[PDB]
Amino acid sequence: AMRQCAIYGKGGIGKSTTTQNLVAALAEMGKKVMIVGCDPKADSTRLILHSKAQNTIMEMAAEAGTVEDLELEDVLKAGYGGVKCVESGGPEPGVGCAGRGVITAINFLEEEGAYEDDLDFVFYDVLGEVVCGGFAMPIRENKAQEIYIVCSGEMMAMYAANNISKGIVKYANSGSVRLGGLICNSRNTDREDELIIALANKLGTQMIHFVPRDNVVQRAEIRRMTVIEYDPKAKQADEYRALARKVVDNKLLVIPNPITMDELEELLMEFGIMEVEDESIVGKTAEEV
Amino acid sequence: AMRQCAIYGKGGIGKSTTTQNLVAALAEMGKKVMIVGCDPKADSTRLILHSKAQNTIMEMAAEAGTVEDLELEDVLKAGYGGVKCVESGGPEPGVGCAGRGVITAINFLEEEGAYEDDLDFVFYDVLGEVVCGGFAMPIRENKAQEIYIVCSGEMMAMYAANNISKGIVKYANSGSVRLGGLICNSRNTDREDELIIALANKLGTQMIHFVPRDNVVQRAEIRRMTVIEYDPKAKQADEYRALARKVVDNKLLVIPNPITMDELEELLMEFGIMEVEDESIVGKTAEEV
Ligand code: SF4
Known about the structure:
Two copies of one chain form a homodimer. With 289 residues, chain A is α/β, with parallel strands linked by helices. Chain A has helices at 15-28, 46-49, 57-64, 72-75, 98-111, 137-140, 155-170, 192-203, 217-221, 227-230, 235-248, 261-271; strands spanning 3-9, 33-37, 77-78, 84-87, 121-127, 146-151, 178-185, 209-211. Bound molecules: iron/sulfur cluster. Chains A, B: Pfam families: Fer4_NifH. Chains A, B: Its cofactor is [4Fe-4S] cluster.
């Protein structure tokens, strides 16, 4: 019943916002959901709590001395729709692998039996910028089963998306770690919907949603809350409900097929974000050409 | 004579472009420089080599079996102005700390006596997104002495700049690792020049340069080359020469003074990128307000 899910993707494309907003649609339709905040900024829970920045397991363990001197009630908060929220906390600048904050944070929650407490969903909001051993921690430790990659029709978000996938693949043979699909966050670039579906099937998954750039997300997030919470009778709000729908309904859980550099640039050139570079101009000064 | 330098800063603000371009200015004014490519994409050497993507120590060790089956001549290339170039290589997606690629890469170069070979400069192009143990590796192993942080008048690039600094500070007491200054890459935001000098002196360093958003950089980089190489008699070109000038001349090497979150938002609000948020609208639906 209780599924183990993760949201992976790069920063600056509104990953957390779509994660939180999704989780809110999912709460209002009956489910009890818990978000684990694996990003080094506390932005993973912000909108559900109406918080400036939630208290994290790292800064609080730094407080009470050790990780066990914390009580569950202090780290794990609940906001909108009784959505349980924790921020894992960043690696202490200079020292500390990021992924070791996350084991600390999951371990702590297993031992205070939050996982065995009545729950339908867990959602790890995870940075999928570089996929190092550190950010791969939910996948290697098999705490995330269903991976949904948020991305956009833009080079880095895509490369990012592929890499997340190569990680899924590393731990294919070890367990139930699978790519459930790609969510596109629009950047009002032309061909981006179908570019992300080109990528989605060339990987062997779908593009389970397309999230439109609606200026109500901005207006709801300045009030530190979801769009499902701010204006439930909105266009965008039903988009979040629709995504959240497709997610329960998803049965499509796969081991992906990473593509190469030339193949990513292929897809980037034919939909138009990338240009066909000229070979004769290369290495030549404006003197020359 | 041979100074050990590093360029730290976040992605997507044109760090490598300014690194490479700087290094070119420095080359035409007589010096012999080597760039070490610590970013997971091969973008750190690209413009000096006119290469699509240079061959990295990770993918080539994966080729010959072990790191010692590689010959110096294969990894270390030279381009414009006899600027020696290597790409370190990323962590293999899923497994591998990023910083362990970098020790491998430096170690390999110490042993084939590239460091003892006549050289005035070494420049580690390093991602300073999160400052984990992994990206702190040049600082903990004291291979970078002079850190220059490229940033912009934008929240994340500044936060990032602060964190790089907290890392400098961790290894204050261990050696000669010092913050030489902040380089601003313009994003044609109003107050950004003086915002980065606010930040610069609130940290205890200067803003050793301001690099203007000139559309010749774009036109030179599409030809896979520097602006010093493409059009030497250009406005931007002299900017790179001027930066490179101030760098030799720099004597100002410090241990920085990291600022807080409230202090960062202070500076963001008074120069105008950040807005003064309203307290009464928070937590309230459009029904309510
Ligand atoms: S695995 Fe990655 S998160 Fe951990 S230290 Fe290494 S580079 Fe940082």
